[PDB]
Every structure is written in structure tokens, then in C-alpha cells.
Amino acid sequence: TRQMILAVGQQGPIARAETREQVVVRLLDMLTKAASRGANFIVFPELALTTFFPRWHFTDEAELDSFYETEMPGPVVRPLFEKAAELGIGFNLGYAELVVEGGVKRRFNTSILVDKSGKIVGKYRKIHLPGHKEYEAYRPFQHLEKRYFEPGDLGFPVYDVDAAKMGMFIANDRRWPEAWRVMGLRGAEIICGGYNTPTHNPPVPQHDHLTSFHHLLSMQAGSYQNGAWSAAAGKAGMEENCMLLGHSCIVAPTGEIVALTTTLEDEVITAAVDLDRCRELREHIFNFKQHRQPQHYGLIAEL
Amino acid sequence: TRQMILAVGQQGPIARAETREQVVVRLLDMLTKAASRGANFIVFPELALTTFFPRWHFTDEAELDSFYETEMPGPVVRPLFEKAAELGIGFNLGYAELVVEGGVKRRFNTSILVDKSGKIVGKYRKIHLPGHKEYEAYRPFQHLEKRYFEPGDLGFPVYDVDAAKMGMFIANDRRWPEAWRVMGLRGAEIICGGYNTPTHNPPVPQHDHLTSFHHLLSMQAGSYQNGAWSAAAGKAGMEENCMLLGHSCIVAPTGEIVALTTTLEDEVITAAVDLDRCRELREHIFNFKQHRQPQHYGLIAEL
Amino acid sequence: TRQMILAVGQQGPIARAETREQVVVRLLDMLTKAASRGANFIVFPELALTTFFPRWHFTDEAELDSFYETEMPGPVVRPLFEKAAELGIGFNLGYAELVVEGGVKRRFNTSILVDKSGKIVGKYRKIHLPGHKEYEAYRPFQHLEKRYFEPGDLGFPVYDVDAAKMGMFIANDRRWPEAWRVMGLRGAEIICGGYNTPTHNPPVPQHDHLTSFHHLLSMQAGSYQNGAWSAAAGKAGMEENCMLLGHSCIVAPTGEIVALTTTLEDEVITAAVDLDRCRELREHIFNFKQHRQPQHYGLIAEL
Amino acid sequence: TRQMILAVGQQGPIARAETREQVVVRLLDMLTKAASRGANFIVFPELALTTFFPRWHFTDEAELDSFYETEMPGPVVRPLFEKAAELGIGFNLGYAELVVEGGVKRRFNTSILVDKSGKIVGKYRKIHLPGHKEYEAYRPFQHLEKRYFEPGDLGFPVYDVDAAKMGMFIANDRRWPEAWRVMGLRGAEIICGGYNTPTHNPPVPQHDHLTSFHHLLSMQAGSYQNGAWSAAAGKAGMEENCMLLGHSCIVAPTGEIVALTTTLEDEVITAAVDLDRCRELREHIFNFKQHRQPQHYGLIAEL
């Protein structure tokens, strides 16, 4: 009947000193709890293996490199893949990727989709890098993603994951209608990803109290307008003196929030997903082929 | 100047036999009340001069033509333009446009922007036509816009209206991120329009209770993601046996609803608008030039 | 750790001709699915064994009586209690109760709490009966609850159900702050019930589009202000030509909706419940003993 | 008359050294702007004449006393009353009240209603005092209202203000259903007040991101369940190193937010108010006399 149970594994803070081994234990616990509640897939946060290091300015490259993965999975993360296969629960894992190509140390904010067999089905590299590239003194904490990562080079792909068409977004990406639309046009039935969203907005502090609103607004609108189920897993709580947004969620193709976290700690939420529900939108009010007039959208793709 | 007061003139039902003269009296009343409350611009509904005729299956061309405007403004509508100039309040008026080219009739669902001097400074023709194409017997009311109108041929332009950059959308258009984005890329500071949205949708009645939700979600998301003020003027109430959605609104560039109607009759709402507020989004989180990666949005413009 | 998994079993329509045996099959299916997802308790709708008969005017007492239960459980409903005990999942069941006392045929809109052992722990009889008492011609459908039931005679009790303090409300009750507050003062940790809420409001049709809003507003506010988890199970869909509201939900003590249904059919939703979370409100902003000034609330209890 | 235009005058921060003369200039500006937009009544914040001093632990009584009013109005505040009478616009003003009885000082967190003739027609003293009673070292700022004020002794009265029945609440009061209900039972058509709500709460920081949610939820629910129009005027912005909540609002008797502020500075919002709108709730779903069962609400009034 094209049904499944989707889960989101929200993470509480990860300390700068907290080891990957310790984080994996936490991820394994949520994956196991999710499976016990019938979930067939669980979405984890953006950069879920470390503290959100872009908040600091690094002068030592070796120290910066320590936060990146040079292989996926390595011996430390391996246990998560083995448990996923064992319990038949796939997952979306976010991490910092370091790959040397043509003499260049390429750094990406990455996420991978692993199926219920523990196999990596697809990868995505964050295209919309927020923040800044140089240290900015007026900020109480930095957001140097433009400095520590380069824009993704895989576009916005949609993969077949256990008979479900899934697309990935990473944090800031969720706020751009273009990311959602490209994946919607590729037939995505589920669009998921994670995020590290501070509740304080240094550039525009007058928007601080709207942090939850803007995050949920983006998820609801993206789902509705593309007739896609969506899920966002945040890493929340007070991490290294910076409060991060919670409200991890699962959203229906109608834009209705069907599951929402209420704590700022490791938390699992689940929701029954019917892939055919996408038709209520994609065959009617949002029947792309019948209603879209692309000859008028050219400006969106102009360089 | 960067400050102004925006108004929305929601309309109650317009009967099939209600004359344009009677409708103009109603529009004049709202425009006058809005100006008395400081407004310098008022947004009126889609097809604001007649009942929403696309709900019927027409068999007589003369009858169909009777609901269109062959000139703008004609002697009957002219008074609205004269009062707008007198009180210094521009407006957005929706109407059915009938044009004859070399003996060939062209039909559009149209809206025009009139400045505080009563001069027409811009036009837009509905690009996203919703509904079905043929008569469907099971429906309590039809929605045959695809038969009675041709998709707009003016694209999604943005016009200068009394020191404000304004873009127009018409009803269904508000649900498409592409419409909003094109105008956002053209620098729109205010994106406005009207709508006739039945609270019942024959093919997907399971979404009926979400009518307000979907309407407001579309306005809030469009405003936020484009850092634009927006306004939607609905024609609400029980019109010719079909209940139409109210909840006309004015929205800030943050996606915050700053004004909302609560009746289903002619109703004026206003809100103070600071055109520089758009910068809170467009120079920061949604600084297009600095964050967008159009090279990866090509699919959106593919025919 | 005072934790559990709460479920809501929303019902789709129940036809006037649909038998209790058929309804029980549907209830058993949801209870089983809920248990498979880890739930320890499931909330069912108000009058969950029959169609919402108050919508019709009855002239035959025998016909009216057919919709009431004279024993709970009887041989037909028995299977549900046996399965609850088997799988270790308690439930809240709503039904029409007919009891003869002192020569009077007493009729109540009732709900019972059954623990994970299949034992009836407590009963509640609807105190706030909405609608009217006499046939009213202007209505497209009636709501004769005042005619078919008498106000409950058990007050608003709170019972110990498997180590959780649970209070019950029935439909309309959820809109009255008094119902919530009495149970809050009695220490309720979970307040639950069901409802049959038409999306059309005959007395005030201008509120039709606010049906979901008012229902969710009532649940969120009640939970927040009493620091109680809550759950509302609706019977939704087109039942005997009357559309009933869906949006069954589970709400945290903060008023946050943690689970929401998206269909208008039989649907199970679940949420992890931590009873100690109530303390975040009841020991702080809503620390009753420290902040309430009952000497000023007398008017609320005046007859 | 049953029609009027209600306004809310949100205040930006008031510095510790900012004089009442300077504050009155700011209040006069908003009152004048509101009247120019047709308003006949404007709601100002709680303790609208000074910085929110309860955030400090005082050690000098003279210093504490300096933040209170010993007369209302004194020569410095009188101009506001004179302008209100001149322009025909009443107001709700919050202030700290110091009364001396037989040499004994009485302190209240107070608000008064002034009609369009500039006459004081009603007073209310905050009954629900939030916060803590002793100095708590870990807090970045205190909230010692329980020490600086005595619970109000006037109950929750409802006054006639220019043909409108108005009731007052002060800040925290808006979160208690009892406050709203008493005024609802007294026939209030408009329930209004102001607030100083930090977006950070030291003892329960996990609710910080819900500050707007909880504030609006309280206003919407109170209005709906009592069929009353309501208005909340906040003093927002970064005041003495503490960020205060904005989102000042005007709400319809249906719980619908009809106007909302979007800045954290002095800001005026207005909305058309029809006093007969209250009937949509109070003569139907919330027809108190016909539906309430006070005999079962006794616990709410128990001391």
C-alpha cells in the first residue's frame, strides 16, 4: 500500500570534547527506539557527529580537520550501519566531509541516505551555505560555513530508498523554495534533512523570537507546494554556550505538521507515511504538468 | 519616502445580477474609508467587478462576454479612478479582460495597479489558471477558468507605484513559489493581489478544513522567502450558493500576518508599511546575490 | 521514569446501518496497530459505537434507544476489552449510556477509562451538552444533545490509570476552561476525550472555516494552562451527509501539538509521554499554590 | 453606538534613566498617531512610565520608590490626559502605584482606563504576580514582583468606557483562565492590558523559543472562550540588557488575531471593533446561561 513509518532522531547538544564513539552510542539508542516503534527510516541532524564547529574561528588546520570525516563509515561509525541493517531501518546522516581531489582539500557539509539494508544509496552536499567567510567581531558566536565548506557539487538529487523517492536538504537549504522545487520536479515523495539553527540571529536580532516560526513555515510551505512528506531533525539545546533550536518535525504533503519534538535533548518522534497521499496535491491543485508555465520562470535560473 | 499605509478592501459576495454601478458604490465606500484611516493604497479582489462566473458552464457567448470589461475604465468604473486621485490613494483592481484583435477575442483574468494620482501604472494577467477544462456533472459548482481565460502573457512584472516597487499575483498564483520568486528577483517590496477561493473543493474535499491554512501558509511563506510585504484581498461569503474564503490579509516581509479580516462582508483592514523592512531579509538570510546558486535551479525553467 | 506512549484512534464515519460488531472490528484494528507501535493507552472518539444520532429528530423511542448501551461491555464490545488486556493497552471509549434509576430512563453521553489489564477504572458523563432541545427547521442537520442526554452527574473526576493521573472530557467540554481547570486542580497529568464536530456551524456559519482552529486552540490552551498532556480523538469524514472534523491530536503540557491526524478515516497517531514534563509548568509559571488567588474567582462558581 | 476603532501602542525599551517627561512625549506621539488613524481608544503597556524595575534586587527603599507614582496624573503625566480629551481617544495606562495609608506604604502593579473625555473611569491592580520572592544569584536578571507589589484588591472589574464594557488584565494575568472568565461573566466586550515579558526565563529556559507562542495562545483562547475582543500592548526590545517580547496584538471574539506588531520599538496598530460581534459566541456556542454548569466548578473557587 506504499506505506511506511518515518522517524526523526533529534539530538541534544554535542560538546566539543564529546567523542564520536559517545555520539554513536546516542545515535544507536535512538535508532533502536525508533525501530521498536515500527519506524523503517530515521532522519538524523546536520553534522550529527560533532559539535557545530562553524561557530569558532580556527587558525590551526589540523584542529579544523579533526571535525571532518575522511571515510564513511569509518570503524567508529560502522556500528550504526550494522544496526540499521540488523533492525531494517534506514537513515539520513549528516556529517562534515573532507575529500582530497586534484590537490585540493575539498570540504563539504554532507548528508547520506542509507537504506534498511545498511547500504549507502545516495549523497548530497549542502548547496546553500549561510553565514559568512571571515571572522566578524560583532557576533557573539560565528557561523563560518562559507569558510569551512564549499557549495555542494551534486545538485539536488532524488534517490530510490526502499521504494520511496527521497530527496535531501541540509539546514539552511530548507528556506529556499528552489531546493524544494527541483526535488519536487524530480518526483520526491519525502524530502528530509537536519539542522543546527541558533535561536539568536546576530545580523538581525529582531527576528530571534521568530526562529521556530521561520523554521516550521519553511517546512510546511515546502511540503505543501511540492506535495511531499518532509522531516527535519535538529540538534538542539545549549551547545557550547549557544542555544540551538528544537522543534524537529515530520510534515505531511498538505503542509500539516504530524509530529513535533518538545524537548531540547535526544528525542525520537514518528509518523505513519502513506506515499500515495502525495497525489492529493500532485494530481490536483499542484498538478505541475497541467498548471505550470515554465516559459515565465526563466529569471529563477539566470546566472 | 519609505513609509506608507497599505489597505485591503475585502469584498462580500457579488450577485450575478448585481450591476457594476452597484459594485463601484461598494468599492468607493471602502476606498474612502481606507483613505480616512491614512491608507495610500488599497488592494481589491480578483474579478472584483462581477460575481465569480467561472463557477458556471456557459453555453451562450454573449452571456459570457457580459462579465468582461472591454475598456478600463469605462464610464461606470471611472468614478473609482476619480476618487482615488482625489483622496490620494492608489489601488489594485481585478477584472475580466476582453480584447478583440483582428476580430479575434482574447480573454484574461486581469489586475491593474493604479497610483495615488489615479493613473494606471501596471497590468498583470493570471498565469496559473486552476480548475478543470470540461464540464463535470458531479460538482455543485464548476471552476472553468482554463476555458474562460488564456494564461497571462505579461510574465510576472514589478512596477513602480508611488515610490514603491509592487508586483501582482492573482488568486491561485499565490500558491506557486515561482510567481513570488520572479517578482522577488525583480526587487518587489510589496506583492499583492486578490482571490475567489471556495472553502469546498469537489475533487479533494478532504482538504476543505485546511482552506484558510493553505491560503495563509502561501502568503506567509512567499513574503518571508522573498522579504516582501504582501496583501491578499478576497471576495468572501455565500456567493451564488458557493461559500468563499475570507481571511484577507496584509503580511510583513518576515511572513508575520499584521492584519486579518474577520467577517465575510465588505471589510477594510490597514497596516503601516516600511519599505526598508525588506532589507532585514534581503540583505541577510535571503541576500540573493550572496547565497543563491542558480546554476543548480535549471530544472525549474525547463519547458 | 514515568514514561509511556499515548495513542489516539481517530474514526472515519460510522453509517446509521453499520453494526456495533463492524465498529468493534475497526476499533480492534486500531488498538492492535497502536500496540504494535508501542502504545500503552489509546483514546477513542465520543459515541464511538454508532453514527452521531443527535443529528436527527426521533419520534420513536425504541429507535432512539437502539443507539444506547445498556451494559458495558456487552457480548459485542467484549472483544475490545479482552484484546486491551492481552496486548497491555488501556483505552478511553465513548458511548451513549442508558440506565434506569428510580423509574427514570437516564441518558448520558459517556466515556470510560480502561487500564492495560482490561479493567474499567473510571467513568465520566458529559457535563456540557451543546446544541438544542427541540427540532429547529433552519438547520440542515440537528444537534439534539440537550434532548437525548442529561448533564453528567459525576463532576470532572481524575483517576489513576496505570500510574498516570487521567481526566476525561467529552467533545464540547474541551472548549470550557472550567472543565480543564477542575481536573488540573485535581492533579491530572493527561486529559483526554473524543468528539464529533461538524465542520458546518448552523447557528453561526461565518465560523465554519475556523472549525479546526477553534478545536486545536481549545486543546492547546487547556494543556498549557494546566500543564497537562492532552489527546482528542475525533470521528471524522462525511457521516450521513454531514462532514465531521478530523485533526485528532496529542498535545504536550506546553500546549505544543506533538501528533496530528491528516486523514478523515480510521487513523492511529502516537506520541511519547513523559509525565514529569508537567512539572515544567506546574512548578513554575503555573505553580497554582504559589500564584492563584481563589478569593477573586468566586463568580466562576456562582449559580 | 456599537462600532469603534481600537489601537495598541506598543513601547520600545524605557531606560533606567529615561524620565517620565521623555516617556510622555513618546506616549503622546503614539496617541496622536492612533487618533489620526481613527482610533478612539489606545492600549499602552504594563508599567508604561518606567523601565521594568522588578528585574533588579533593590537594597534602597528611596530608589525603589522613585519608580512609583504617588498621584495620577501628576503634572508630568497630565499632558497625556489633556491630549486624550482633545483628540477624543481614551487609553489604558499601566504604572506602579504607591499609596500611603496611615504612614504605611501600599504597592501595586496598576492600570487605569481613561475615556475619550480624559476622565479616569476605572482601575485594576495586578492579581497574579509572577516570578520569585528572593534574590537568586544564577539569574541574569530577576523578576521580583512578589516583593515589590501586593496582589490586587479590586478583583477583576468591568467598566463602562464610552459605550464599551471593558475589563483589564496586567501581563501575567492573561495566562490565567480565571481572570478572563470573571470578566467574561461580568459581560466584558473588550479585555485589554499590557506586558513586560522577557524572551528568556531563567528557571525554564527550555520554553524560551515558545515565548511568542504562549503569549498569543493565551490571548486567542481567552478571547474565543469568552467571546471578547482583546488587546495586549507589550513593552518590547532590549531594555537594560534584557530582551522583551513584542508581538503586541488585537484579537477578535473568535480568537482571530486581527492586528500584530512586527517591530520591537514604539509601534501603533489599529483594528475596527464591532461590539456586537461578541454575540456570535455569547449567544451561541458560549451562551453561558444556557450551557454552563457552575454547580460543578466549585473547586476553582476553593481557597
Ligand SMILES: CSCC[C@@H](NC(N)=O)C(=O)O
Ligand atoms: C545563518 S542562517 C540561520 C542558521 C542556519 N543554520 C544552518 N546550519 O544552516 C539555518 O538556515 O538554519
Ligand SMILES: CSCC[C@@H](NC(N)=O)C(=O)O
Ligand atoms: C481551484 S484551485 C483553488 C481555488 C483557486 N481560486 C482561484 N480563483 O484561483 C485558488 O487557488 O485560490
Ligand SMILES: CSCC[C@@H](NC(N)=O)C(=O)O
Ligand atoms: C454544537 S457545538 C459544536 C459541536 C460540538 N460537538 C459535540 N459533540 O459536542 C463541539 O463542541 O465539538
Ligand SMILES: CSCC[C@@H](NC(N)=O)C(=O)O
Ligand atoms: C515571570 S512569568 C513570565 C513573564 C511575565 N511578565 C510579567 N510582567 O508579568 C508574564 O506572564 O508575561
